[PDB]
Every structure is written in C-alpha cells, then in structure tokens.
Amino acid sequence: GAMKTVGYAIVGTGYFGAELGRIMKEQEGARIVAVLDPENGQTIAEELDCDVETDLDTLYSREDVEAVIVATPNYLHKEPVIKAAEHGVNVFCEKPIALSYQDCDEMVRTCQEHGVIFMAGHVMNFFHGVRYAKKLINDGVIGKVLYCHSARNGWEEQQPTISWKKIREKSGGHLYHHIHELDCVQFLMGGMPEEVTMTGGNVAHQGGDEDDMLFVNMQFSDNRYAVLEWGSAFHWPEHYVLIQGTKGAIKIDMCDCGGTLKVDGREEHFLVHESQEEDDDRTRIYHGTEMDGAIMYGKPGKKPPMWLHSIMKNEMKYLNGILHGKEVDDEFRPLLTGEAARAAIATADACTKSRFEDRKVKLSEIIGEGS
Amino acid sequence: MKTVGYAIVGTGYFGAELGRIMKEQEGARIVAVLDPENGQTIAEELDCDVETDLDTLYSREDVEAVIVATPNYLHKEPVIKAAEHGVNVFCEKPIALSYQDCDEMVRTCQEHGVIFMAGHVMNFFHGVRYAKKLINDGVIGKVLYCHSARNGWEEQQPTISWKKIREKSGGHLYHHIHELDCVQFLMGGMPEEVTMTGGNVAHQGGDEDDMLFVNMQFSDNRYAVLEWGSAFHWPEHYVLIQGTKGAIKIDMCDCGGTLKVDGREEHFLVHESQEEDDDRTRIYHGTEMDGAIMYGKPGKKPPMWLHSIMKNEMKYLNGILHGKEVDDEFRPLLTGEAARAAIATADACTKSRFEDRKVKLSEIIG
Ligand SMILES: NC(=O)c1ccc[n+]([C@@H]2O[C@H](COP(=O)([O-])OP(=O)(O)OC[C@H]3O[C@@H](n4cnc5c(N)ncnc54)[C@H](O)[C@@H]3O)[C@@H](O)[C@H]2O)c1
Ligand SMILES: NC(=O)c1ccc[n+]([C@@H]2O[C@H](COP(=O)([O-])OP(=O)(O)OC[C@H]3O[C@@H](n4cnc5c(N)ncnc54)[C@H](O)[C@@H]3O)[C@@H](O)[C@H]2O)c1
C-alpha cells in the first residue's frame, strides 16, 4: 500500500518554524524538501537534512514543493502565502494570520482563487480541554453560552534586548500575538461580535512601545457578551477561559492547569492537555516564571514546553491528513474555509481602532458585507 | 456624655437593624421611627414613638439626627426635610438614583449646616481598611488596575421585590454600588471616561439588567473593569488591586484577603475574625444555586460579617455626632465627595449602556 509523499517547504525556521519542521518530517507521507530563513536557514537545513532557498518564487517553482509551512514573524506572513498560492502551493500559516484584515482577506481570497488549500494555525483548537469544552457545549450540558471571560495577564521585566514580539508594528502587540484567546471566544460564541470596545495603554513600561494592559468588551447578537484581558503589567497572574451558560459553566485554566465543569451543585475536572503530566508541567512553568513572564516567549535556539510540543504534533498531523485527501471535520472546517482567519483579524482590527480612536467600533466598520 | 436622639425613616431589613444597633451605643437614644408598612412593629421592639409626617417628625425637640434607610428611590425627600429642620443625616447607599438628586442632597445639608454621612459600609470592612494601609505605605507601589466582580445566579422568585425593579433599585450598578465606590476610593477619585455593556440575558418576562460589564479609564494611564449580575453559574465576588510592586485580592466568595509582593504571599482577614470570613464562605456555598435568598426583607437578619460592620459604622457615626473629629480615612463620607463620585460614575455607566457609546464624566460634572 504505497501512500503518497507531500514535499513541504518551511519559510521561517526560528523557535516555532524549526520545530514544526522537526515534527512534519516524521509524519507518514511527509518530506521536508527545503527551507528559507536569512538568519537561521543554513543551521535548520543541516539539522533537517534538506535544501536552502533564498527566493520565494524559485522555492515555490520547484516540482518537489507541493505545500509550505509559513512561520515568519507576525508582520511577514503576507508575501510568502500570496506567492505560494500564485505557484499552486498549499499553505499552512501561523497565527496571527496578518496584522490587518486587508492583508488577511487578500491572503484567503488569493488561495481560494488559485484553488490551493489555506489552513489557519489557530493551535488552541487542538488543546484536549478546548475540544472537550466544545463537545459539552454542543451536547447542551451548560445550555446556551451567554458570556465568555478570557485573561492572559502576567508581569514581564524589561529584558537586555527588545524582541520583535515586543514591537507593536512587528508583533501587533498582545491582542494579535496572543490572539488565541480571541479566536477561542469567537469559536465558542459561534462567530464575531456586532460591536467591541477596548481600553488600555502602556502603564508600567514607558522607559518596548507595546500596550502592557488591554481590556476588551464584546457585544454579540441575541444578548450575549464577552470580556478579554491581556498584558505584561499584572503582578496577579491569570491565564484562563471561562464559559458561562443558561445551565452551567466551564473553566479552562492554563496557570493552575486544569478544566472545571459546574452543573447543578456538581463539579467535574478534566485535562486541558493530553495527560495529567502535561497539565502539571504547565503549572510548574507558570509558578517558576511568575516574577518575569518574558522568559516564556520563544527565540531561535529554545524548545517549546510539553503541552505545546504535543498540540504542534496534533496540528501538523491534521494538516498532513488534509493534504493526503482526508475530509475536514465540521470541528476544524473554519480553519480552512477562511472564516476563522477573517473573524480573528477583523475583531482584532476593530478592537485596535476602538482603543486608538477612544470610541466603540462596529465590526461592519471592518467587514462592509465584502463578497 | 450627651445623649443624641435618632429618628429612623425606613425600618425594614437594614433600617430596623441599624436601630437595634444605635439604641445600644453610648450617648444614643431612638426617639421615633416612620415606615407606613413596618413602623408600628419596629417601634414596639425599639420602645419608641411612631410619626407619619416627615416635617412633624423633624420638628420634634428630641430629634437631632436621622438614619435614612427607605428603598433606593425614596432617599431624596427624607434627607432634604431633615436638613430644612436643622437635623443631622446618615443616608444608606445608593445615596440617590441620579447625580442631580445626590448633588441637591449634599448641597442642601451643606447650606443648612447639618452633617451628611454617606452609608458606604464597605469602607468599614477590616480587609478594605488593611488594603488602604498597605497601598498608602507603598507596599504594592502605584495602583494601575482594579478588577471587581459580583456575579452569581438568581432563580426567578414568586413575588418581584423592589430591589429587582430598575426604576426602584437602580439595578445591580446602584444597588451593589459598594464595588464602584471601593474602586473609586483605591484609585483616589472618579475616572475620566466609562463604557458599560450588558442586558437581560437569561431573565426575560424582572426588567433589571442581569449582566453588566464596566470599562473605566482613569487619569495618568490607569484602568478598571467591574462585573455585576444574576446570570453567572460560575460565582465570583472579589476586588483585585494590581500595582507596580504587588497585588491585593479581597475575596468575598472564598472569604479571605491575599497580599502578593516579591515571591511572598500573606493572608489577612476581610472581616473581624476567621469565624466571620468562614461564615461568609459557608453562606456563598449554601446559596450558589440561588443568590436571591441573600437579599434582605422585612423580618430577616443580616450575616455576622454584615451585622459587625453595621456596628463599626453606627459607632463611627455616633462618635461624629458627639463632636469626634473625622479621620482623613472617612472624610470623603462627610465632605460629599464619595456620594457625588459614586452616583456621577453610575449615571455615566447607565448612559453609556442605554445609549450604546463611551461617556466622559465631564458629561455629568462639567
Ligand atoms: N501557534 C503557537 O503556539 C505559536 C507560538 C510561538 C510562535 N508562533 C508564531 O510563529 C511565527 C514565528 O515566531 P517564532 O516564535 O518562531 O519567532 P522566532 O524569532 O523564533 O522566529 C522567526 C524566524 O523568522 C526568520 N525570518 C526573518 N525574516 C524572514 C523572512 N523574510 N523570510 C523568512 N524567514 C524570516 C528569523 O530569522 C527567525 O529565524 C509567528 O507567526 C508567531 O506568532 C506561534
Ligand atoms: N449597606 C448595606 O449593606 C445594605 C444592605 C441592604 C440594604 N441596604 C439599603 O437599605 C435601604 C433599605 O433596604 P432594605 O434592605 O431595608 O429594604 P426592605 O424592603 O427590607 O426595607 C424597606 C422599608 O422601607 C419602608 N418604606 C417604604 N416606603 C417608605 C417611605 N415613604 N417612608 C419610609 N419608609 C418607607 C418599607 O415599608 C420597608 O419597611 C436601601 O437604601 C438599601 O440599598 C444597604
């Protein structure tokens, strides 16, 4: 029984890109043909035992490149996805898809028009506890979802070098760089809100031009709401998603790692990740890095925690399945139709606008009933 | 020790109990009460007179001070007439259901030279007082952010209480204004700009909003988030205070205070003893499925934690009315600053929500 090989290029072979390469390489029917990275491409090509390309059009033009993993910095996703689509190459793109809805919409439409595949790297949807939460919600356990509350709040000391992840024009700041929590809320509420308000600023880090506190206030259709908090100036650390419905509530805690279901007077626990060891390992890490959350951000030469390494495996395996003709499940459909890429960058843009312009923003002000 | 004669206007759950308390303080007598419904009953218990007209009641020689504990909508008439007749005033939260109403009440009492104490009882919680001591000493550094919540689940009762009618209670924002007052005290004033969202999500048929989310912008790059309501199946009741060097949590569901500074973590009591804190926690656990039973009625009794701060407060008030100097700590409960700041910001939030836009507090002060 043959089983067809797909040739993968990797564009951007830093912390996350290098590791997606290590992972895809060892999946069934998958080969790393070549990578592109001006800084770290020679190094990671020696490790993966593949070629080095320096031009996108040359790279995509190769017969042996049928698919590309895009993991450049957040601001540099546009050019690699558009050229792969132009050369008939299927695409996986890291979060955040882009730093503007214009950019994200052009990327999804180009890939649709050239009939290639576009998978959005919204990796939180592969977390065991997120999947369990969706199963419980769809089964009607907590009833209709009324309210989601996210937070991703820690304290970051000012480092010796300022990373690109810390520059707003390159990272898009906390809202874009940690968009997982916005995407998560949007998935659980079944789409975008009608209207957002975001406040915050740089409260403690004025000396890294990023906002260090952000507070979002979302109004959804048919009387539902959400509140989302981010940043790097909170001396009381918090990282969770809370889901409150007509019959019950669910908490996915990522600081004290565990899931909680509340129904009647009853209270069940469930795993966020693949095993009690992964959950407990996460909890140890957050305890260790309470005084300085800055050490938690990846660099070329560092390695992801267990919980993250495992969902990267789940995700690279799901992607490889798709590219071998596997049917997509309703559960992950929105990572390919483009609905989730668009919904996350739309709402992010809407929030960014709200804050810089000091006013409430309708999501129509970013969509416009486009196509 | 001189005797002060107190009238009580409104002798339901809270008013009756403030009377029981003041009665047994040094230099304090309950001369008479007024309550169409429950006045005859509570006058038999307190062994005092019954009046049916405010002007007649205040006109008595023997009435030098009034405790006002009518429903939230009915504070205006009793405070203005007491001021007109030279009578000193204590008024229950929320002072009024409009800034116009609250401003008129503070100015009338100032103009007639009588005393006006705002019943912002959360400021007498041991853990609130401790939090202020820590903040002012510089332990957590500059306060950047406050996060309050008061979120539980209320089942729909057989009869609709006035506390559940928006026109009469002013809804969660006014009826549970303690948390807004608390944040305003810790941030040292009102915000520059507010946004409030929410609605009736689960209770359509009790016209109150059952979820409210406030987003406050303060001067010099500071913020707060405040949550309220009666449609949350994950109960939460706390105030969290995050600064440049540390953070403090006052938890009222899992009752205890927490200080975080460097890698250190200290516990402190919210209330007067570990028994009061634990008693609170038991109650919140007991009433998780229906927080509606926690709201007072004529004939019912406040928890230990609440009974005790009512004692702290009635004693502080009685001290003031015996010529005791006010401490900087409670000054704003008499100057009118706290009554005005709480109803201004509440009005601003209410406006924001019904009009679907951000509201500057200049739009209420100016
Ligand atoms: N899904 C997740 O959980 C997760 C976690 C971390 C990072 N990420 C995402 O991964 C992507 C990369 O982030 P990272 O953590 O690897 O950062 P990083 O600094 O570790 O990696 C960036 C790499 O891109 C290279 N690069 C720079 N310019 C390039 C160009 N023009 N073409 C190709 N490569 C170029 C850099 O030299 C570096 O090797 C981002 O989209 C980021 O948001 C995702
Ligand atoms: N500070 C606190 O912790 C706290 C707690 C509960 C209530 N309160 C406040 O106490 C006040 C009353 O609340 P409650 O719990 O006692 O409500 P309640 O229903 O228990 O008592 C209200 C009483 O006012 C009487 N009343 C009605 N109209 C009147 C009028 N025109 N003149 C005089 N009395 C009149 C009613 O008959 C009733 O006896 C409100 O301001 C409320 O917000 C404060």
**CA-wise closest residue to B71 among B157, B164, B179:** B164
Q: Is there a contact between B92 and B75 (Cβ–Cβ < 8 Å)? A: yes
Q: Where in chain B is the domain with CATH 3.40.50.720?
A: 4-122
Q: Taking CB atoms and an 8 Å limit, are A204 and B244 in contact across chains?
A: yes
Nearest to B239 by CA among B217, B218, B220, B257: B257
Helix axes A276-288, A306-322, angle to 10 degrees: 130
Which residues in chain B belong to E strands, given as ranges?
A: 4-9, 28-34, 49-50, 65-68, 88-92, 116-119, 143-153, 193-199, 211-218, 222-229, 231-243, 246-251, 256-261, 264-268, 359-360
Whether B312 has its CB under 8 Å from any CB of chain A: the answer is no
How many angstroms separate the Cα of B345 from the Cα of each of A214, B94, B116, B267, B299?
21, 12, 20, 32, 33
Q: Which CATH superfamily is domain A125-362 in?
A: Dihydrodipicolinate Reductase; domain 2 (3.30.360.10)
Question: What class has domain B123-363?
Answer: alpha beta
Q: Within a 10 A sphere around the Cβ of B249, how many other Cβ atoms?
A: 19
Partners of B289 on chain A (C-beta within 8 Å) are 264-265
The tokens for B5 are 């004669």
Ligand 2 atom 4, closest CA: B14
Q: Is A288 exposed, middle or buried (0-12, 13-18, 19+ CB in 10 A)?
A: exposed
Write out the residue limits of the CATH 3.40.50.720 domain(s) in chain A: 6-124
- How far from B347 is each of B182, B214, B340, B350, CA to CA, in Å? 17, 12, 11, 5
Neighbours of B167 (CB within 10 A): 12
For residues A344 and A27, what is the distance between their CA atoms, to the nearest angstrom? Answer: 29
> Whose atoms come closest to the Cα of A35: which ligand?
1
Asked if the bond preceding B94 is cis, omega within 30° of 0, the reply is yes
Residue A336 to residue A117: CA distance in whole angstroms: 7
CA-closest candidate to residue B242, choices B332, B139, B345, B125? B139
**What's the distance, CA A301 to chain centroid?**
21
What's the reported resolution, in angstroms, to a tenth?
Answer: 2.6
Residues of chain A with CATH 3.30.360.10: 125-362
The closest alpha carbon to A91, from A74, A115, A75, A73, belongs to: A115
Any A CB within 8 A of B288 CB? yes
Chain breaks in chain A (C to N over 2.5 A) after: 207
C-alpha closest to that of A148 among A200, A112, A183: A183
Contact A219 B234 (CB under 8 A): no
Taking the CA atoms of A156, A161, A163 and A164 in sequence, report the sign of the dihedral they define: positive
**How many degrees, rounded to 5, is the angle at CA A30 between CA A28 and CA A32?**
145
Written as six digits, the tokens of A338 are 């483009």
**Technique used to solve these coordinates:** X-ray
Q: Does B223 touch chain A (CB under 8 A)?
A: yes
Report yes or no: A158 at the B interface, CB cutoff 8 Å. Answer: no
Cβ(B69)–Cβ(B75) below 8 Å: no
User: Structure tokens of A343?
Assistant: 């919904």
**C-beta of residue B150 within 8 angstroms of C-beta of residue B171:** no
Give one DSSP letter per residue of B176-216, joined into a string: TTHHHHHHHHHHTS--SEEEEEEE-SS-----S-SEEEEEE
**Does the beta-carbon distance from A203 to B145 stay under 8 Å?**
yes
Does residue A299 line the site of ligand 1, with CB under 6 A?
yes
- Ligand at shortest distance from the CA of A121: 1
Domain A6-124, second-level architecture: 3-Layer(aba) Sandwich (3.40)
d(C-alpha A316, C-alpha A54), whole Å: 24
Question: Which residues have C-beta within 8 Å of that of residue A364, sequence separation ≥ 6?
Answer: none
Amino acid, single-letter form, for residue A193:
P
List, in sequence order, every beta strand (DSSP E) within chain A.
6-11, 30-36, 51-52, 67-70, 90-94, 118-121, 145-155, 195-201, 213-220, 224-231, 233-245, 248-253, 258-263, 266-270, 361-362
Which part of chain B is CATH 3.30.360.10? Answer: 123-363
Query: Of A259, A7, A16, A238, which Cα lies nearest the Cα of A123?
Result: A16
- Chain A closest CA to B291's CA: distance in Å? 13
**Residue located via tokens 């008439």:** B77
Does residue B211 belong to the interface with chain A, where contact is any CB pair within 8 Å? yes
Residues of B in contact with A204 (CB under 8 A): 144, 244
Please give the distance, rounded to the nearest whole angstrom, from the Cα atom of residue B70 to the centre of ligand 2: 4
* Residues in B touching A149 (Cβ below 8 Å): 227
A76 CB under 6 A from ligand 1?
yes
Residue A73, ligand 1, Cβ within 6 A: yes
Specify whether the CB–CB gap between A151 and A238 falls below 8 A. Answer: yes
- Could you give the CA distance from residue B176 to residue B171 in angstroms, rounded to a whole number? 8
- Six token digits for residue A163: 């990373």
Distance from residue A13's CA to the centre of ligand 1 (Å):
7
Give the minimum alpha-carbon distance from A246 to chain B in angstroms, rounded to a whole number: 7
Q: Compute the CA torsion angle A232, A237, A241, A242 (nearest 10 deg).
A: -130
Judged by its nearest atom, the ligand closest to the C-alpha of residue B73 is 2
Ligand 1 mean position to B5 CA, how many Å? Answer: 75
Q: Which amino acid is at A24?
A: M
Interacting residues of B29 by C-beta distance below 8 A, sequence separation 6+: B3, B4, B5, B6, B23
Strand partners, A32: A8
Q: How far is the C-alpha of B344 from the C-alpha of B347, rounded, in Å?
A: 5
Give, in degrees to the nearest 5, the angle at Cα B313 between B308 and B318: 125
- Tell me which chain A residue has its CA closest to the CA of residue B222: A203
Return the DSSP state at B140: S
DSSP B175: H
Residues of chain B neighbouring A249 (CB-CB closer than 8 A): 232-234
Spatial distance between the Cα atoms of B181 and B192, rounded to a whole number of angstroms: 15
Rounded to the nearest whole angstrom, what is the distance from the C-alpha of residue A74 to the centroid of ligand 1?
7
Query: What 3-state class would DSSP assign to A281?
Result: helix
* Interface check B221 vs A, CB under 8 A: yes
Q: Scan for tokens 């009009």, then name that residue.
A: B355
Q: Do A234 and B225 touch (CB under 8 A)?
A: no
Q: B4-122: which CATH architecture? A: 3-Layer(aba) Sandwich (3.40)
Q: Is the CB of A101 under 6 A from ligand 1?
A: no
Measured CA to CA, the distance from residue A71 to residue A11 in angstroms comes to: 6
Instruction: Report how far residue B350's alpha carbon sits from residue B199's, in angstroms, rounded to the nearest whole number.
Output: 11
**Which two tokens mark B232?**
């949350």
A229 touches chain B (CB under 8 A): yes
The CA radius of gyration of chain A, in Å to the nearest whole number, is: 20
Peptide bond into A96 cis (omega under 30): yes
Question: Binding site membership of A for NAD(+): which residues?
Answer: 15-16, 37, 40, 74, 77, 94-95, 164-165
